[PDB]
């Protein structure tokens, strides 16, 4: 059994001196007893596969990038969140009536979960006026005002979270103004998150669950205390 396997793998074991000595000694003992497109190591072809992450749609969110400005996190085949980097704001008040939204209980629970994860993942968020929201009728509209060192700014923390959440295709909109350490700066004044219906938007990057799953561990890791009894 092992003799055949050794016979198959002959070309790769000549260079060893011990193998040559063993072969020569075996031959001598037998004789004396009779007297009385990418190929590696010559045999390994380099092959590839690409995973179709879309098939995970029923059990986990999938994020993808359409272009610099538009990105999506889809939940199933019916709903999702459109995230837009933009200079055009759609909310011009300072309210975010989260408690009333919860009391009314009209929103999609999965989408509210994703909003909560995003917001809880922002590091060092400390300017509540920078976040405005509209939840009337169960819709979800969230507007982060990125206007203004760049490291200690709401814009940087929001953009770090956005980069992770829409990982893959986020970078094209990001780090135009290269900052100190890991800090991010862009030319956009607002990040807007609104619900949307399902459509194939993934022109720039393949849909993927990686960003969301990774962000799950970031929740609450870098939130500031705002009262003594949380």
């Amino acid at each position: 059994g092992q003799i055949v396997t050794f016979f198959q793998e002959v070309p790769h074991v000549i260079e060893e001196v011990m193998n040559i000595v063993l072969i020569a000694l075996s031959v001598l003992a037998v004789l004396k007893g009779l007297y009385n497109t990418s190929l590696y190591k010559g045999v390994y072809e380099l092959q590839t596969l690409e995973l179709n992450m879309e098939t995970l749609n029923m059990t986990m969110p999938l994020s993808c990038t359409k272009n610099n400005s538009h990105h999506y996190i889809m939940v199933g085949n019916e709903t999702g969140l459109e995230l837009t980097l933009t200079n055009t704001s759609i909310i011009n008040h300072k309210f975010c009536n989260l408690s009333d939204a919860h009391k009314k209980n009209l929103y999609d629970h999965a989408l509210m979960s994703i909003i909560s994860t995003f917001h809880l993942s922002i590091p060092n968020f400390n300017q509540y006026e920078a976040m405005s929201c509209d939840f009337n009728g169960g819709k979800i509209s969230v507007q982060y005002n990125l206007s203004h060192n760049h490291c200690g700014t709401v814009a940087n923390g929001v953009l770090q979270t956005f980069m992770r959440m829409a990982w893959g295709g986020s970078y094209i909109a990001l780090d135009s103004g290269r900052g100190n350490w890991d800090c991010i700066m862009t030319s956009y004044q607002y990040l807007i998150i609104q619900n949307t219906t399902w459509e194939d938007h993934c022109q720039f990057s393949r849909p993927s669950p990686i960003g969301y799953l990774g962000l799950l561990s970031q929740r609450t890791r870098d939130i500031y205390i705002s009262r003594r009894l949380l």
Partner: antibody
Amino acid sequence: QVQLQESGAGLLKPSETLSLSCTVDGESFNGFFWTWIRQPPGKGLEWIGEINHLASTGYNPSLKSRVTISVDTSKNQFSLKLTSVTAADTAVYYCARGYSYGFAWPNYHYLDVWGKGTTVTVSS
Amino acid sequence: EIVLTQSPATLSLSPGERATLSCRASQSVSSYLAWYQHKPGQAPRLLIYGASKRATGIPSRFSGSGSGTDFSLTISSLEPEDFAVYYCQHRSDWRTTFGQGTRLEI
């Protein structure tokens, strides 16, 4: 094909309140800034204000205290209220559909669909 | 707040002549200006937007250019129906402002 139909009385006396309404038929109501503009006689165009489908509004400062703009998404209309109108408020009033593009530079904004316009005069 | 000053106050030109109108902003623009044509008895009509893009139904003789604080509208060979009052308009976030207007007459 989009039409904006304006309704509202144009014959007023001073200290009354002007009420104008504009109904949109054609294309979506969201993603636009529904806008009120006016031209006083012998003057140029003047932005009164704007509102979007989330009821967020922007007003001209010189009129902020007196101007209110509202929407009704059920019948795709938006309304302008001007309180305590004086002789300086005589003008032609237009409603318009505004679109703002801020996703890439150069950003742009325009008013592409306009209503007919309503003359409003205040006198004794 | 950004304000727009138009130049000149009025223009006197013949049909077939080249018309050039300027709009100067008090600071670098939040977004590129747009240009409207207005005649008595009707609503203003969007001519140009993004400082250089023709709107629907606008003849190719209408062109625009500019950036920063300087913008211009050009009518290469002006037709008799091009005589009207022209406005530049700008929008910063939730604040729209108009130029004072330029009168183009024969």
